[PDB]
């Protein structure tokens, strides 16, 4: 089972990415996570991303499509995967079509622009695993520590009001058009489209997803 998460920044795609992963098995492919790992481990394929990311700008299609093509490669993704943060553009979406990468479901996480700044300013992550918390809306069992390894949590470098603003716009310019893209795919029968209310409580969106899938 292949799946795509599609939504504004802070819409809770990642938070939902974890669940589907542990409950269905399929690995979670988060471009942003890979970019941040690579940027930190100084990998050759990704380290370049650094300045762009911290600016709020999207990274060049070519670099990202590569990474994804390299990760889907792994044998863990032979039974399905979860593209969480990709595609982010028509080119990127197009590139997947030619490569013959079909998805079973496309899930649009609907969340208002006004809700975004506050979700994001209070988001903390366990970088090593990408596990994502929120100091108020979905905190850790122990303040400042990852629930599975007890490791200190951190705040993302690009998680600041200003950068979130720049981030929202690009979303509206480049990514947003994709809702239309997959709507059309869904209409042709190529995929299954599903919008869900991302303002609801985590535990609740979780159940909506479970209704949509199985
Ligand atoms: N459904 C929700 N309601 C309230 N807060 C949420 C919800 N889902 C996620 N969050 C919190 O919002 C922040 C951003 O969500 P995240 O899952 O990181 O989304 P995205 O991956 O789309 O940016 C995190 O701090 C997260 O714990
Ligand atoms: N699929 C992508 N296409 C282009 N840029 C991306 C992509 N995914 C992640 N990035 C970069 O990763 C950063 C953080 O994305 P995220 O962690 O998914 O919110 C963005 O600010 C972009 O610069």
PDB file of C-alpha atoms and ligand atoms in Angstrom:
ATOM      1  CA  UNK A   1       0.000   0.000   0.000  1.00  0.00           C
ATOM      2  CA  UNK A   2       1.422   3.330  -1.153  1.00  0.00           C
ATOM      3  CA  UNK A   3       0.208   6.626   0.348  1.00  0.00           C
ATOM      4  CA  UNK A   4       0.816  10.386  -0.052  1.00  0.00           C
ATOM      5  CA  UNK A   5       0.268  12.987   2.685  1.00  0.00           C
ATOM      6  CA  UNK A   6      -0.596  16.414   1.269  1.00  0.00           C
ATOM      7  CA  UNK A   7      -0.926  19.500   3.394  1.00  0.00           C
ATOM      8  CA  UNK A   8       0.233  22.899   4.548  1.00  0.00           C
ATOM      9  CA  UNK A   9       3.213  23.027   6.925  1.00  0.00           C
ATOM     10  CA  UNK A  10       2.179  22.115  10.482  1.00  0.00           C
ATOM     11  CA  UNK A  11      -1.013  20.380   9.243  1.00  0.00           C
ATOM     12  CA  UNK A  12       0.044  17.296  11.225  1.00  0.00           C
ATOM     13  CA  UNK A  13       1.215  15.114   8.361  1.00  0.00           C
ATOM     14  CA  UNK A  14       4.260  13.767  10.153  1.00  0.00           C
ATOM     15  CA  UNK A  15       2.367  13.153  13.431  1.00  0.00           C
ATOM     16  CA  UNK A  16      -0.044  11.051  11.376  1.00  0.00           C
ATOM     17  CA  UNK A  17       2.847   9.550   9.395  1.00  0.00           C
ATOM     18  CA  UNK A  18       4.090   7.720  12.501  1.00  0.00           C
ATOM     19  CA  UNK A  19       0.727   6.065  13.218  1.00  0.00           C
ATOM     20  CA  UNK A  20       0.044   4.619   9.790  1.00  0.00           C
ATOM     21  CA  UNK A  21       3.635   3.368   9.841  1.00  0.00           C
ATOM     22  CA  UNK A  22       3.424   1.399  13.033  1.00  0.00           C
ATOM     23  CA  UNK A  23      -0.064   0.187  12.252  1.00  0.00           C
ATOM     24  CA  UNK A  24       0.380  -0.837   8.611  1.00  0.00           C
ATOM     25  CA  UNK A  25       4.120  -1.454   8.451  1.00  0.00           C
ATOM     26  CA  UNK A  26       4.975   0.644   5.351  1.00  0.00           C
ATOM     27  CA  UNK A  27       8.071   2.861   5.895  1.00  0.00           C
ATOM     28  CA  UNK A  28       7.760   6.618   6.233  1.00  0.00           C
ATOM     29  CA  UNK A  29       9.616   8.588   3.581  1.00  0.00           C
ATOM     30  CA  UNK A  30       9.944  12.173   4.765  1.00  0.00           C
ATOM     31  CA  UNK A  31      11.961  14.276   2.443  1.00  0.00           C
ATOM     32  CA  UNK A  32      12.503  16.958   5.018  1.00  0.00           C
ATOM     33  CA  UNK A  33      13.747  14.409   7.484  1.00  0.00           C
ATOM     34  CA  UNK A  34      16.226  13.023   4.958  1.00  0.00           C
ATOM     35  CA  UNK A  35      17.294  16.547   4.068  1.00  0.00           C
ATOM     36  CA  UNK A  36      17.973  17.382   7.718  1.00  0.00           C
ATOM     37  CA  UNK A  37      19.851  14.095   8.345  1.00  0.00           C
ATOM     38  CA  UNK A  38      21.964  14.577   5.254  1.00  0.00           C
ATOM     39  CA  UNK A  39      22.594  18.220   6.083  1.00  0.00           C
ATOM     40  CA  UNK A  40      23.846  17.107   9.532  1.00  0.00           C
ATOM     41  CA  UNK A  41      25.767  13.956   8.589  1.00  0.00           C
ATOM     42  CA  UNK A  42      27.194  16.091   5.799  1.00  0.00           C
ATOM     43  CA  UNK A  43      26.092  13.432   3.252  1.00  0.00           C
ATOM     44  CA  UNK A  44      27.028  14.317  -0.317  1.00  0.00           C
ATOM     45  CA  UNK A  45      23.468  13.996  -1.586  1.00  0.00           C
ATOM     46  CA  UNK A  46      21.654  16.561   0.540  1.00  0.00           C
ATOM     47  CA  UNK A  47      24.092  18.744   2.451  1.00  0.00           C
ATOM     48  CA  UNK A  48      23.428  21.500  -0.093  1.00  0.00           C
ATOM     49  CA  UNK A  49      19.900  21.884   1.174  1.00  0.00           C
ATOM     50  CA  UNK A  50      21.028  23.665   4.367  1.00  0.00           C
ATOM     51  CA  UNK A  51      20.663  27.385   3.481  1.00  0.00           C
ATOM     52  CA  UNK A  52      17.479  26.951   1.432  1.00  0.00           C
ATOM     53  CA  UNK A  53      15.694  25.117   4.277  1.00  0.00           C
ATOM     54  CA  UNK A  54      16.646  27.671   6.919  1.00  0.00           C
ATOM     55  CA  UNK A  55      15.351  30.351   4.612  1.00  0.00           C
ATOM     56  CA  UNK A  56      11.969  28.703   4.176  1.00  0.00           C
ATOM     57  CA  UNK A  57      12.461  28.150   0.447  1.00  0.00           C
ATOM     58  CA  UNK A  58      11.823  24.898  -1.324  1.00  0.00           C
ATOM     59  CA  UNK A  59      14.865  22.889  -2.337  1.00  0.00           C
ATOM     60  CA  UNK A  60      15.500  22.207  -6.099  1.00  0.00           C
ATOM     61  CA  UNK A  61      13.325  19.455  -7.587  1.00  0.00           C
ATOM     62  CA  UNK A  62      16.240  17.650  -9.013  1.00  0.00           C
ATOM     63  CA  UNK A  63      17.991  17.093  -5.658  1.00  0.00           C
ATOM     64  CA  UNK A  64      14.889  15.816  -3.890  1.00  0.00           C
ATOM     65  CA  UNK A  65      13.623  13.535  -6.663  1.00  0.00           C
ATOM     66  CA  UNK A  66      17.062  11.920  -6.469  1.00  0.00           C
ATOM     67  CA  UNK A  67      16.900  11.239  -2.723  1.00  0.00           C
ATOM     68  CA  UNK A  68      13.416   9.775  -3.029  1.00  0.00           C
ATOM     69  CA  UNK A  69      14.477   7.633  -5.970  1.00  0.00           C
ATOM     70  CA  UNK A  70      17.368   6.444  -3.809  1.00  0.00           C
ATOM     71  CA  UNK A  71      15.249   5.649  -0.771  1.00  0.00           C
ATOM     72  CA  UNK A  72      12.367   3.938  -2.503  1.00  0.00           C
ATOM     73  CA  UNK A  73      15.233   1.748  -3.747  1.00  0.00           C
ATOM     74  CA  UNK A  74      15.676   0.157  -0.315  1.00  0.00           C
ATOM     75  CA  UNK A  75      14.021  -3.245   0.056  1.00  0.00           C
ATOM     76  CA  UNK A  76      11.860  -2.107   2.965  1.00  0.00           C
ATOM     77  CA  UNK A  77       9.785  -0.098   0.470  1.00  0.00           C
ATOM     78  CA  UNK A  78       8.899  -3.101  -1.672  1.00  0.00           C
ATOM     79  CA  UNK A  79       5.576  -3.623   0.109  1.00  0.00           C
ATOM     80  CA  UNK A  80       4.575   0.000   0.134  1.00  0.00           C
ATOM     81  CA  UNK A  81       5.707   3.320   1.445  1.00  0.00           C
ATOM     82  CA  UNK A  82       4.444   6.632   2.777  1.00  0.00           C
ATOM     83  CA  UNK A  83       5.572   9.761   0.983  1.00  0.00           C
ATOM     84  CA  UNK A  84       5.289  12.378   3.735  1.00  0.00           C
ATOM     85  CA  UNK A  85       6.364  15.711   2.221  1.00  0.00           C
ATOM     86  CA  UNK A  86       6.623  14.686  -1.433  1.00  0.00           C
ATOM     87  CA  UNK A  87       5.679  15.573  -3.980  1.00  0.00           C
ATOM     88  CA  UNK A  88       5.780  19.273  -3.214  1.00  0.00           C
ATOM     89  CA  UNK A  89       5.478  20.405  -6.853  1.00  0.00           C
ATOM     90  CA  UNK A  90       3.945  19.512 -10.227  1.00  0.00           C
ATOM     91  CA  UNK A  91       7.417  18.658 -11.631  1.00  0.00           C
ATOM     92  CA  UNK A  92       8.061  16.381  -8.628  1.00  0.00           C
ATOM     93  CA  UNK A  93       4.575  14.827  -9.066  1.00  0.00           C
ATOM     94  CA  UNK A  94       5.151  14.480 -12.810  1.00  0.00           C
ATOM     95  CA  UNK A  95       8.570  12.800 -12.225  1.00  0.00           C
ATOM     96  CA  UNK A  96       6.873  10.078 -10.182  1.00  0.00           C
ATOM     97  CA  UNK A  97       4.400   9.343 -12.989  1.00  0.00           C
ATOM     98  CA  UNK A  98       7.094   8.728 -15.612  1.00  0.00           C
ATOM     99  CA  UNK A  99       9.054   6.610 -13.158  1.00  0.00           C
ATOM    100  CA  UNK A 100       5.863   4.551 -12.787  1.00  0.00           C
ATOM    101  CA  UNK A 101       5.424   5.307  -9.089  1.00  0.00           C
ATOM    102  CA  UNK A 102       1.665   5.024  -8.426  1.00  0.00           C
ATOM    103  CA  UNK A 103       0.063   5.677  -5.074  1.00  0.00           C
ATOM    104  CA  UNK A 104      -3.026   4.033  -3.681  1.00  0.00           C
ATOM    105  CA  UNK A 105      -4.329   6.947  -1.629  1.00  0.00           C
ATOM    106  CA  UNK A 106      -3.674  10.691  -1.468  1.00  0.00           C
ATOM    107  CA  UNK A 107      -4.740  12.237   1.837  1.00  0.00           C
ATOM    108  CA  UNK A 108      -5.306  15.979   1.982  1.00  0.00           C
ATOM    109  CA  UNK A 109      -4.953  17.345   5.535  1.00  0.00           C
ATOM    110  CA  UNK A 110      -7.162  20.408   5.720  1.00  0.00           C
ATOM    111  CA  UNK A 111      -5.943  23.024   8.230  1.00  0.00           C
ATOM    112  CA  UNK A 112      -6.442  26.822   8.366  1.00  0.00           C
ATOM    113  CA  UNK A 113      -3.554  29.209   7.861  1.00  0.00           C
ATOM    114  CA  UNK A 114      -4.217  30.903  11.199  1.00  0.00           C
ATOM    115  CA  UNK A 115      -3.628  27.659  13.092  1.00  0.00           C
ATOM    116  CA  UNK A 116      -0.169  27.089  11.604  1.00  0.00           C
ATOM    117  CA  UNK A 117       2.094  29.597  13.315  1.00  0.00           C
ATOM    118  CA  UNK A 118       1.127  28.365  16.808  1.00  0.00           C
ATOM    119  CA  UNK A 119       1.306  24.658  16.031  1.00  0.00           C
ATOM    120  CA  UNK A 120       4.793  25.036  14.619  1.00  0.00           C
ATOM    121  CA  UNK A 121       6.364  27.372  17.233  1.00  0.00           C
ATOM    122  CA  UNK A 122       5.675  24.725  19.863  1.00  0.00           C
ATOM    123  CA  UNK A 123       6.825  21.659  17.913  1.00  0.00           C
ATOM    124  CA  UNK A 124       9.766  19.603  19.199  1.00  0.00           C
ATOM    125  CA  UNK A 125      11.285  16.565  17.538  1.00  0.00           C
ATOM    126  CA  UNK A 126      13.423  13.553  18.155  1.00  0.00           C
ATOM    127  CA  UNK A 127      15.676  14.103  15.161  1.00  0.00           C
ATOM    128  CA  UNK A 128      17.129  10.597  15.157  1.00  0.00           C
ATOM    129  CA  UNK A 129      13.732   9.054  14.523  1.00  0.00           C
ATOM    130  CA  UNK A 130      11.790  12.080  13.378  1.00  0.00           C
ATOM    131  CA  UNK A 131       9.181  11.543  16.122  1.00  0.00           C
ATOM    132  CA  UNK A 132       7.233  14.795  16.497  1.00  0.00           C
ATOM    133  CA  UNK A 133       5.620  16.396  19.582  1.00  0.00           C
ATOM    134  CA  UNK A 134       3.937  19.601  20.563  1.00  0.00           C
ATOM    135  CA  UNK A 135       4.521  21.110  24.023  1.00  0.00           C
ATOM    136  CA  UNK A 136       0.766  21.791  24.402  1.00  0.00           C
ATOM    137  CA  UNK A 137      -1.311  19.834  21.807  1.00  0.00           C
ATOM    138  CA  UNK A 138       0.512  16.504  21.895  1.00  0.00           C
ATOM    139  CA  UNK A 139       3.354  16.527  24.429  1.00  0.00           C
ATOM    140  CA  UNK A 140       5.767  13.821  25.546  1.00  0.00           C
ATOM    141  CA  UNK A 141       5.154  11.530  28.509  1.00  0.00           C
ATOM    142  CA  UNK A 142       8.180  13.231  30.096  1.00  0.00           C
ATOM    143  CA  UNK A 143       8.889  16.905  29.461  1.00  0.00           C
ATOM    144  CA  UNK A 144      11.611  17.308  26.848  1.00  0.00           C
ATOM    145  CA  UNK A 145      12.248  13.610  26.230  1.00  0.00           C
ATOM    146  CA  UNK A 146      11.434  11.245  23.423  1.00  0.00           C
ATOM    147  CA  UNK A 147       8.906   8.645  24.562  1.00  0.00           C
ATOM    148  CA  UNK A 148      10.686   5.625  23.027  1.00  0.00           C
ATOM    149  CA  UNK A 149      14.374   6.251  23.830  1.00  0.00           C
ATOM    150  CA  UNK A 150      14.317   8.868  26.553  1.00  0.00           C
ATOM    151  CA  UNK A 151      16.565  11.132  24.379  1.00  0.00           C
ATOM    152  CA  UNK A 152      16.521  14.926  24.641  1.00  0.00           C
ATOM    153  CA  UNK A 153      14.157  16.594  22.190  1.00  0.00           C
ATOM    154  CA  UNK A 154      14.970  19.585  19.982  1.00  0.00           C
ATOM    155  CA  UNK A 155      13.365  22.419  18.074  1.00  0.00           C
ATOM    156  CA  UNK A 156      13.820  22.554  14.277  1.00  0.00           C
ATOM    157  CA  UNK A 157      16.071  25.265  12.870  1.00  0.00           C
ATOM    158  CA  UNK A 158      13.394  26.412  10.449  1.00  0.00           C
ATOM    159  CA  UNK A 159      10.645  26.556  13.087  1.00  0.00           C
ATOM    160  CA  UNK A 160      10.219  30.273  13.688  1.00  0.00           C
ATOM    161  CA  UNK A 161       7.289  32.590  12.926  1.00  0.00           C
ATOM    162  CA  UNK A 162       9.027  34.440  10.041  1.00  0.00           C
ATOM    163  CA  UNK A 163      10.270  31.342   8.263  1.00  0.00           C
ATOM    164  CA  UNK A 164       6.832  29.783   8.784  1.00  0.00           C
ATOM    165  CA  UNK A 165       5.350  32.712   6.936  1.00  0.00           C
ATOM    166  CA  UNK A 166       7.715  32.364   3.966  1.00  0.00           C
ATOM    167  CA  UNK A 167       6.986  28.628   4.150  1.00  0.00           C
ATOM    168  CA  UNK A 168       3.216  29.109   3.874  1.00  0.00           C
ATOM    169  CA  UNK A 169       3.434  31.206   0.730  1.00  0.00           C
ATOM    170  CA  UNK A 170       5.604  28.706  -1.178  1.00  0.00           C
ATOM    171  CA  UNK A 171       3.060  26.204  -0.072  1.00  0.00           C
ATOM    172  CA  UNK A 172       0.345  28.255  -1.667  1.00  0.00           C
ATOM    173  CA  UNK A 173       2.337  28.913  -4.832  1.00  0.00           C
ATOM    174  CA  UNK A 174       4.045  25.571  -5.544  1.00  0.00           C
ATOM    175  CA  UNK A 175       2.492  22.762  -3.508  1.00  0.00           C
ATOM    176  CA  UNK A 176      -1.189  23.756  -3.288  1.00  0.00           C
ATOM    177  CA  UNK A 177      -1.775  23.154  -7.049  1.00  0.00           C
ATOM    178  CA  UNK A 178      -1.213  19.462  -6.323  1.00  0.00           C
ATOM    179  CA  UNK A 179      -4.668  19.148  -4.701  1.00  0.00           C
ATOM    180  CA  UNK A 180      -6.040  19.775  -8.152  1.00  0.00           C
ATOM    181  CA  UNK A 181      -3.486  17.403  -9.644  1.00  0.00           C
ATOM    182  CA  UNK A 182      -4.508  14.357  -7.635  1.00  0.00           C
ATOM    183  CA  UNK A 183      -8.155  15.354  -7.694  1.00  0.00           C
ATOM    184  CA  UNK A 184      -7.876  14.712 -11.413  1.00  0.00           C
ATOM    185  CA  UNK A 185      -5.938  11.501 -10.847  1.00  0.00           C
ATOM    186  CA  UNK A 186      -8.679  10.337  -8.472  1.00  0.00           C
ATOM    187  CA  UNK A 187     -11.330  11.169 -11.058  1.00  0.00           C
ATOM    188  CA  UNK A 188      -9.612   9.060 -13.684  1.00  0.00           C
ATOM    189  CA  UNK A 189      -9.417   6.134 -11.272  1.00  0.00           C
ATOM    190  CA  UNK A 190      -5.630   6.232 -10.904  1.00  0.00           C
ATOM    191  CA  UNK A 191      -5.843   6.868  -7.163  1.00  0.00           C
ATOM    192  CA  UNK A 192      -8.102   7.424  -4.139  1.00  0.00           C
ATOM    193  CA  UNK A 193      -8.440  11.005  -2.868  1.00  0.00           C
ATOM    194  CA  UNK A 194      -9.415  11.875   0.743  1.00  0.00           C
ATOM    195  CA  UNK A 195      -9.610  15.125   2.629  1.00  0.00           C
ATOM    196  CA  UNK A 196      -9.623  15.116   6.415  1.00  0.00           C
ATOM    197  CA  UNK A 197     -10.115  17.767   9.078  1.00  0.00           C
ATOM    198  CA  UNK A 198      -6.715  18.530  10.516  1.00  0.00           C
ATOM    199  CA  UNK A 199      -8.036  20.855  13.215  1.00  0.00           C
ATOM    200  CA  UNK A 200      -9.488  17.905  15.247  1.00  0.00           C
ATOM    201  CA  UNK A 201      -7.619  16.254  18.058  1.00  0.00           C
ATOM    202  CA  UNK A 202      -4.722  14.049  17.057  1.00  0.00           C
ATOM    203  CA  UNK A 203      -6.469  10.961  18.513  1.00  0.00           C
ATOM    204  CA  UNK A 204      -9.488  11.855  16.436  1.00  0.00           C
ATOM    205  CA  UNK A 205      -7.797  12.445  13.088  1.00  0.00           C
ATOM    206  CA  UNK A 206      -6.170   9.086  13.777  1.00  0.00           C
ATOM    207  CA  UNK A 207      -9.523   7.411  13.748  1.00  0.00           C
ATOM    208  CA  UNK A 208     -10.628   9.200  10.585  1.00  0.00           C
ATOM    209  CA  UNK A 209      -7.558   7.925   8.811  1.00  0.00           C
ATOM    210  CA  UNK A 210      -8.310   4.429  10.150  1.00  0.00           C
ATOM    211  CA  UNK A 211     -11.756   4.764   8.619  1.00  0.00           C
ATOM    212  CA  UNK A 212     -10.336   5.824   5.282  1.00  0.00           C
ATOM    213  CA  UNK A 213      -7.791   2.988   5.045  1.00  0.00           C
ATOM    214  CA  UNK A 214      -8.646  -0.115   7.050  1.00  0.00           C
TER     215      UNK A 214
HETATM  216  N1  LIG B   1      -4.187  17.146  14.999  1.00  0.00           N
HETATM  217  C1  LIG B   1      -3.487  18.010  15.721  1.00  0.00           C
HETATM  218  N2  LIG B   1      -3.998  18.916  16.558  1.00  0.00           N
HETATM  219  C2  LIG B   1      -3.207  19.758  17.218  1.00  0.00           C
HETATM  220  N3  LIG B   1      -1.909  19.724  17.091  1.00  0.00           N
HETATM  221  C3  LIG B   1      -1.295  18.844  16.277  1.00  0.00           C
HETATM  222  C4  LIG B   1      -2.112  18.001  15.579  1.00  0.00           C
HETATM  223  N4  LIG B   1      -1.452  17.182  14.800  1.00  0.00           N
HETATM  224  C5  LIG B   1      -0.173  17.561  15.013  1.00  0.00           C
HETATM  225  N5  LIG B   1      -0.043  18.541  15.912  1.00  0.00           N
HETATM  226  C6  LIG B   1       1.206  19.160  16.459  1.00  0.00           C
HETATM  227  O1  LIG B   1       1.464  20.200  15.510  1.00  0.00           O
HETATM  228  C7  LIG B   1       2.833  20.347  15.221  1.00  0.00           C
HETATM  229  C8  LIG B   1       2.951  20.200  13.710  1.00  0.00           C
HETATM  230  O2  LIG B   1       2.394  19.012  13.119  1.00  0.00           O
HETATM  231  P1  LIG B   1       3.278  17.949  12.250  1.00  0.00           P
HETATM  232  O3  LIG B   1       2.732  16.643  12.541  1.00  0.00           O
HETATM  233  O4  LIG B   1       4.674  18.248  12.539  1.00  0.00           O
HETATM  234  O5  LIG B   1       2.837  18.264  10.782  1.00  0.00           O
HETATM  235  P2  LIG B   1       3.464  18.463   9.334  1.00  0.00           P
HETATM  236  O6  LIG B   1       4.267  17.227   9.310  1.00  0.00           O
HETATM  237  O7  LIG B   1       2.340  18.503   8.368  1.00  0.00           O
HETATM  238  O8  LIG B   1       4.250  19.692   9.480  1.00  0.00           O
HETATM  239  C9  LIG B   1       3.481  19.286  16.061  1.00  0.00           C
HETATM  240  O9  LIG B   1       3.972  19.939  17.173  1.00  0.00           O
HETATM  241  C10 LIG B   1       2.412  18.297  16.401  1.00  0.00           C
HETATM  242  O10 LIG B   1       2.695  17.540  17.553  1.00  0.00           O
HETATM  243  N1  LIG B   2       9.721  17.510  -1.267  1.00  0.00           N
HETATM  244  C1  LIG B   2      10.380  18.668  -1.203  1.00  0.00           C
HETATM  245  N2  LIG B   2      10.590  19.495  -2.257  1.00  0.00           N
HETATM  246  C2  LIG B   2      11.266  20.615  -2.108  1.00  0.00           C
HETATM  247  N3  LIG B   2      11.759  20.976  -0.916  1.00  0.00           N
HETATM  248  C3  LIG B   2      11.601  20.230   0.164  1.00  0.00           C
HETATM  249  C4  LIG B   2      10.897  19.081  -0.012  1.00  0.00           C
HETATM  250  N4  LIG B   2      10.752  18.393   1.091  1.00  0.00           N
HETATM  251  C5  LIG B   2      11.426  19.130   1.987  1.00  0.00           C
HETATM  252  N5  LIG B   2      11.945  20.220   1.432  1.00  0.00           N
HETATM  253  C6  LIG B   2      12.663  21.225   2.128  1.00  0.00           C
HETATM  254  O1  LIG B   2      12.543  20.729   3.451  1.00  0.00           O
HETATM  255  C7  LIG B   2      12.154  21.805   4.307  1.00  0.00           C
HETATM  256  C8  LIG B   2      11.271  21.364   5.449  1.00  0.00           C
HETATM  257  O2  LIG B   2      10.177  20.543   5.005  1.00  0.00           O
HETATM  258  P1  LIG B   2       9.324  19.744   6.099  1.00  0.00           P
HETATM  259  O3  LIG B   2      10.299  19.226   7.076  1.00  0.00           O
HETATM  260  O4  LIG B   2       8.730  18.660   5.274  1.00  0.00           O
HETATM  261  O5  LIG B   2       8.386  20.775   6.652  1.00  0.00           O
HETATM  262  C9  LIG B   2      11.375  22.780   3.446  1.00  0.00           C
HETATM  263  O6  LIG B   2      11.453  24.104   4.084  1.00  0.00           O
HETATM  264  C10 LIG B   2      12.050  22.610   2.093  1.00  0.00           C
HETATM  265  O7  LIG B   2      13.140  23.546   1.977  1.00  0.00           O
END
